[PDB]
């Protein structure tokens, strides 16, 4: 009849003495162990709820839309944001700011095919140039995810030795990884006391300022020479929209928003298609054997010339599926992105109260027994039935659902089949290490769950 049951906390310390060393995650999982599927953890002073598995996540972000469906914070990054641009807002804020964003995302977007496909050949076109060379392919697969959102916000696309676009995608890389970080999921427990002390928080709000900064000279630009009936991208469209409402009482078209909004998506534009793709191209060393079979069905569908299209997916059910396993596997954002509820809300018997975050540990869906064979194993067939044809599943979720649903899994798909298939066509992968010696254990695993790093070559098959 109250908030639900859960590992009984100290005064100050809340739960810190049931975590696992480990982390955030390792410590929800046992705590499922115990006490089932939705469950109280405090984390630092405040009761999180959890909830875990297909049905309780589904039950609380679509049955309860409304009732689920505000942002938490992210520790680490929430004196940057405060509260600012899409990913972080509530309210009408959100409203207003998802809304822009999907739109705007579309009118340029779902041409956005075009531009995957354009940035697919110049991206063919550099790893010839390296002539089968070991490299790292980290700030490629940044490079080319970014280029993409690039060309939608700032309406053009970036040159790969271009020294200012490298020095943003390091800032991403390493911001995404001290928010995950150990030190990540401590300051989330205990912010209150350790942001008096120096850490990583510090480096993460610099590094947050200086994107923002460039961001915000970039908008200096646009103002310069804009065309209120030629918009060139989202952030002119922005500049309309605020011209449009400067006279309103309270616009949610203010400066913070523009620069943190771009910020936001620029940022979650990036980096995890980039990511899952990291974490693919991994797998394909370690598992050949989908990767020349994945060869084999472009052979069939596309041939070795032709440049491969959205049109293509539902003729490669096996590919997809490969894709649909990478993402699962990679499980990416274990927790999603912090929610709280809007109401005093009624679950399964239990009462949370407005403004009580909730945490979905979305990689409990996707390692659901029911769902998967061996959920802990890269196994393609678990997207596939017995003929070999696409098998969708109601536990494949790792965009989350309902209203907060990722803005981006449309491109995100886009992105991954056509960059994807794109490289397989034209590229074989090696690597020193022996494919059963390659170790897929993550080098962070917060927020975000991020790769070892790995040398790769791609050798032609021409
Ligand atoms: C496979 C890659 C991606 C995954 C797995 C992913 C996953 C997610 C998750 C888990 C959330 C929030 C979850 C929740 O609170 O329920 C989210 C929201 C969001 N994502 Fe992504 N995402 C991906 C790619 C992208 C891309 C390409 C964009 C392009 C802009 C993007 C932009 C956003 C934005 C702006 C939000 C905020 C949604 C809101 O607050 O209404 N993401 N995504
Ligand atoms: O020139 C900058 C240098 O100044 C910095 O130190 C600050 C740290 O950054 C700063 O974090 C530390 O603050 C002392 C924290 C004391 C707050 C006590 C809190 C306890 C919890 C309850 C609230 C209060 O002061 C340090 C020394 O003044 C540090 O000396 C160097 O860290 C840094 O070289």
Redesign the pocket.
Known sequence: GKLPPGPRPLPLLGNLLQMDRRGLLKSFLRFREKYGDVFTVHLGPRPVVMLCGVEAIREALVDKAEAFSGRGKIAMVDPFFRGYGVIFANGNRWKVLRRFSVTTMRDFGMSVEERIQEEAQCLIEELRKSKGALMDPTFLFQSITANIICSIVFGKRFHYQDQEFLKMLNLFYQTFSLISSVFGQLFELFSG?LK???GAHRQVYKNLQEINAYIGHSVEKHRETLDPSAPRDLIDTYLLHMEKEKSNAHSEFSHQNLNLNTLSLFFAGTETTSTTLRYGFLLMLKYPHVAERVYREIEQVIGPHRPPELHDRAKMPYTEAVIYEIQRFSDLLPMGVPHIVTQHTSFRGYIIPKDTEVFLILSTALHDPHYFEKPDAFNPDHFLDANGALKKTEAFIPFSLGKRICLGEGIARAELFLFFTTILQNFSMASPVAPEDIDLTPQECGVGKIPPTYQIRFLPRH
Request: hydrophobic content about 50%; glycine content about 0%; cysteine-free.
């Open positions: 006391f008096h002390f120096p």
